[PDB]
Write a protein that binds this DNA or RNA. Structure first.
Lengths: 93, 323, 110, 82, 99, 94, 105, 82, 97
DNA sequence: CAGGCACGTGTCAGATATATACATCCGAT
DNA sequence: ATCGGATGTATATATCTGACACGTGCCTGGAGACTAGGGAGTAATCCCCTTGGCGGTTAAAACGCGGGGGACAGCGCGTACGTGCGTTTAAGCGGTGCTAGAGCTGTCTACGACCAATTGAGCGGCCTCGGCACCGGGATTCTCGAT
DNA sequence: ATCGAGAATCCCGGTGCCGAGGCCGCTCAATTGGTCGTAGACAGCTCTAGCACCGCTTAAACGCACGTACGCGCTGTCCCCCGCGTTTTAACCGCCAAGGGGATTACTCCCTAGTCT
């Protein structure tokens, strides 16, 4: 069937950073698994936050708090800053 | 004295039956409608109606809104809903209920024109119900029902003189009209501990004299079909009526006649009287009740008067069995 | 009506699919309703993490005189960094190997 | 069939190579039985969960996805496959 | 002398560098596959294994054993010793929480 | 008034069922409540994950039984599976 | 019988576990056989914990379960200690254990 | 009140009693500073998550449930508090 | 002048503190330390008493486990006196470093 | 959707835990 | 052998608990018999992927043996850490007083679920040549007994 | 305390190879445009408990005295594991069958929804 993968997006990001590098199939699969694992961790933590705070919706606040609570230190700071920038750009239309 | 209040509540109960498929609301709504319809007063406030049993918070708030505005916003919305109205109109057809109407509306079948154009999607019972939609919804005058009772009794006695046939229900109670026929039959050779073709002979004989026009289902215990009185060669033909015939063992026949005679309130009162007199009465027979609630061997039943004497209660005519 | 359709990721200036992230969030049974700002934030975070790890992997591959990232380069990039190592402490990379680390006592004393 | 007495297939040079990748200088002679025992315990623990996973699905072939899930259950999170 | 014999210990650091630089399995395929099949035979009879599942088990087992051996070496260095012993693995497993 | 939720009465009933002549303190009541909540959360999370894994959209007794088998160790898992199957059989038999 | 718990012969509330299974958004549909199984499992686990605590409570001429008794019951058993190896209970203390090396000559 | 030093409030007899409960016999003189350091780093690790949980709820009071949840997030589940 | 041999009083207090369940840490200094550590992340915070108590119990459990592992390492090192290298080894093996 | 009642919460007499005096009992110097 | 902490025993606080009183939101709620569809079980076949058997090569495992460097036991020492005692100081308990913010409730309103309708991005299939694996030899570098 | 000899490794170059990357033809999930029900953002209240302060009380903490035992360094014994050479051996690759497991259909058969007294 039509199995879904982040392969094209990982390749696009790779050409956005290192224009003259390649990537093998095993490395691409490892990147896909890493993306899936991080997504599962962040989504589960956000869902737990929503249930814990008696809320029924997960919003940018829940995702931002989950990112600040999972990612360590300066990585979390950069992720929060760039996520806020992306949300502002999207809501600016 | 609640014609406006009771009528608007009637269609409300249907939606949880045919659309929402929630019996737990439909039964409560119809019980509330029945208890309000019997109350001989103008209803002014919902809190006043809360005194009556079976009326709760939701019914009170809704009757208050109906008295304030003359309608219900939920009811008005759901009236203009094409899907819900189509489902209700389909469920008006016999054999079509919640699942059938839901599926038909899902596949675009919403009107009787679609039912007539889609004969292949209907079984035998659904096709019979579609053919006689108008006829089945008509009421039966008592004189016509007397005529067809005489015809049925004549045919059953023609099959065999030992047969006993009783037309129970509102007719037996003496009501001027009824929506269907409940025919109860027994045979001396057929008891609880004793032929599968006894009903078949009667069905074939009634089909021979062209009284029964259609067959919905025919088994060894009960038969459901359509019958129609013949016209006298010059008048308009009588509308088709659905007739139900049930075969009961001899030791259970009189109890079945009592159960199917009615009314429902009368049957409930008789069951309560039996329970307080240490007996249990069901559709089949009557059992005595022990001190610990264990039911014993069922008592022999040979007449309705015997059943009344079992529970130490005076025999009541079916005309007096309103409640 | 029916204006020129544009992907919401293009509106947010992201490479990762915000729509697919939104669909996965809705179908993952995390909450019975999902806000509009969650998918873009999550996609931005994922894009940042992938960009960081891919930059480190590319640097390691260039230091290894290869122009094609292999799992060994990913393992080197993950374990060499400090924050990424703690983020991914409990993960084993297939065909990743082990970073060269010999205890000082085991070195030839001479 | 009836595979029996097969834990010995993990040869002593294989254990030596694994320890050298670990980074040890010299290896005692009594360590191989202990290493085989802990390997058997870990393999049994993972395989039991994998077999339980491949039984809820009503299937007779153990896929790599079930192995990855069983590893993730006890905190291993194997990347790569799947 | 007549042969060129390396001192005991250099032939350790040599190929420590090799086996830390390279990323092969270091365990033979068929013996491990047979061991996995024999272990799984105890739970349910007549079970088939995909090759990818066996490879995943091999990778996970090798990573776990490498980590355990690193912890054992650390414990041995702590004990003022360069030879690892079974009691060192016992101590490492007890501290890690597996025993 | 905020009606707080706890399993205190059921834990007390279970204690009287197996140890008729003893009592239990409030701190132990809180510990039992936390333990029951934690075990329920663990089993429910594992069952939901298994349901998503097997592409299903319904949690029935099969997922709960498999989650109990995975979470609880050998003897406890076997006894819990036996108790659950017996309870399900008794419930459906009525 | 009227309530669902008495029909299955359990002490834990089946309907409450059912309500939590809906509220806890674990899946959009939960079958009716899941809550009774979960309630039976929870009741059995609680029964084992309480029985082991009482077997440890009774010993010290005390007829009231204390968090110390719960800690002793969990740590002394092998199966429950593996089930709750990463759980610390308030006022629980530790098992009495002194190494033989530290013992006097 | 801006507090300057309180890690010295975890006195030497307190560390000694904790070690005795742990099961040791003799304690060296350098154990106290290392124990204070590891206590401080563990307290910061727990408190950061607890304060984040409190801030996400738009509250200014750190309840016991936030601390319990933060401890659960690190695998150190705590019973008897909620 | 009846002076006990060195170790016997330790073998006494070890049993005393293993059969007990008290806090063993003074509450006010621990509360002050918690407040000082928390004020570095967000100024002007207030704590529930149960929160401070839960922090104290969790910290006590962590430190008791750490000392258990430290004693294990020290006995493995052919000693009875724990030294900070034992604590560092236990923390590194446990995965905290 | 609706009553029946199973929990939740609050109260108070009181079994049970705890602390405080004296008489044995066992490890050290 | 005798003297300080563990034991036991009787008694007197004291205290936190389990049986009632009452309020309040969950929750469990017509059965039966005659008709159909429909999942389940069996039976029967098509891919086909993993399993099993036979045979040939050879890299890897097994075995023997000579050390030599480390595991380990014993001795001596010195100073760091234990136990004990007098003195201080700060936790702890118990009040008093204040108010910041947790908790609850009413109210709209902006926001997300949901459904036709549309269409462009991503996935499956199919090339193809270039980074990379491998081989070969020469140059470079690491290690070891010898002087 | 280096030096020549022996061995391990690096570098450079040549050669073949198979999958990384690109292109084409789709499918169906992402996107638009609306409607409609409700979660919660936001004010307003209570009133709980968290904080601040003060005054005994005494038990824990601290500083010092002093003894001794254990961590550590040193020395000597011996033993067993490592490095290397020789001898199996089954790991691995190649081929075949092959056979039931997954994937469909064919037929039937009891379970159950509907449906209506």
């Amino acid at each position: 069937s039509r199995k879904e993968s982040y392969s094209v997006y990982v390749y696009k990001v790779l050409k956005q950073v290192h224009p003259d590098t390649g990537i093998s199939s095993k490395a691409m699969g490892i990147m896909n698994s890493f993306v899936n694992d991080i997504f599962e961790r962040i989504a589960g933590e956000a869902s737990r936050l929503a249930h814990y705070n008696k809320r029924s919706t997960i919003t940018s606040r829940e995702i931002q708090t989950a990112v600040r609570l999972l990612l360590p230190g300066e990585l979390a700071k950069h992720a929060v800053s760039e996520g806020t920038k992306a949300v502002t750009k999207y809501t600016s239309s | 004295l609640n014609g406006g209040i009771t009528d608007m509540l009637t269609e409300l109960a249907n939606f949880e039956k045919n659309v929402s498929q929630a019996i737990h609301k439909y039964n409560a709504y119809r019980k509330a409608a029945s208890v309000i319809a019997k109350y001989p007063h103008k209803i002014k406030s919902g809190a006043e109606a809360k005194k009556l049993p079976g009326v709760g918070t939701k019914i009170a708030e809704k009757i208050d809104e109906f008295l304030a505005t003359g309608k219900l916003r939920k009811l008005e919305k759901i009236r203009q809903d094409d899907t819900s109205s189509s489902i209700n109109f389909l469920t008006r057809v016999s054999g079509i209920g919640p699942s059938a109407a839901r599926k038909f509306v899902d596949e675009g079948i919403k009107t009787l024109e679609d039912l007539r154009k889609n004969e292949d999607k209907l079984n035998h019972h659904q096709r019979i119900g579609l053919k006689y939609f108008g006829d089945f919804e008509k009421r039966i005058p008592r004189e016509e029902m007397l005529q067809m009772q005489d015809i049925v009794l004549n045919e059953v006695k023609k099959v065999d003189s030992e047969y006993i046939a009783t037309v129970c229900g509102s007719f037996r109670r003496g009501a001027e009209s009824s929506g269907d026929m409940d025919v109860l039959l027994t045979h001396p050779s057929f008891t609880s501990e004793s032929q599968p073709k006894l009903l078949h002979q009667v069905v074939e004989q009634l089909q021979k004299v062209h009284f029964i026009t259609d067959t919905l289902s025919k088994g060894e215990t009960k038969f459901m079909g359509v019958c129609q009185l013949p016209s006298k060669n010059d008048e308009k033909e009588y509308p088709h009526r659905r007739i139900d015939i049930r075969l009961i063992p001899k030791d259970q026949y009189y109890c079945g006649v009592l159960y199917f005679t009615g009314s429902d309130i009368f049957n409930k009162n008789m069951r309560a009287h039996a329970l307080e007199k240490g007996f249990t009465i069901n559709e089949y027979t009557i059992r005595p009740l022990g001190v610990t609630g264990v039911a014993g061997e069922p008592l022999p039943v040979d007449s309705e008067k015997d059943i009344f004497d079992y529970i130490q209660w005076k025999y009541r005519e079916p005309k007096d069995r309103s409640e | 009506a029916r204006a020129k359709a544009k992907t919401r990721s293009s509106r947010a200036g992201l490479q990762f699919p915000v729509g697919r992230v939104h669909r996965l969030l809705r179908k993952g049974n995390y909450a019975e309703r999902v806000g509009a700002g969650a998918p873009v934030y999550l996609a931005a975070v994922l894009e940042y993490l992938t960009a960081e790890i891919l930059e480190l992997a590319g640097n390691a591959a260039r230091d290894n005189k290869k122009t094609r990232i292999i799992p060994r380069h990913l393992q080197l990039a993950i374990r060499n960094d400090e924050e990424l190592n703690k983020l991914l402490g409990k993960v084993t990379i297939a065909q990743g190997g082990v970073l060269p680390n010999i205890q000082a006592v085991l070195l030839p004393k001479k | 069939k009836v595979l029996r007495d097969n834990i010995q297939g993990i040869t002593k040079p294989a254990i030596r190579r694994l320890a050298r990748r670990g980074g040890v200088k010299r290896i005692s002679g009594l360590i191989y039985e202990e290493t085989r025992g802990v390997l058997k315990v870990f393999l049994e623990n993972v395989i039991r969960d994998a077999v339980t996973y491949t039984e809820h699905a009503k299937r007779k072939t153990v896929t790599a996805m079930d192995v990855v899930y069983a590893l993730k259950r006890q905190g291993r999170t194997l990347y790569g496959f799947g | 002398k007549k042969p060129h014999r390396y001192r005991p210990g250099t032939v350790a650091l040599r190929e420590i560098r090799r086996y830390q630089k390279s990323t092969e399995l270091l365990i033979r395929k068929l013996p491990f596959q047979r061991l996995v099949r024999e272990i799984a035979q105890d739970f349910k009879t007549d079970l088939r294994f995909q090759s990818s599942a066996v490879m995943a088990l091999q990778e996970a087992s090798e990573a776990y054993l490498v980590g355990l051996f690193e912890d054992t070496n650390l414990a041995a260095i702590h004990a003022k010793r360069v030879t690892i012993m079974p009691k060192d693995i016992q101590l490492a497993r007890r501290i890690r929480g597996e025993r």
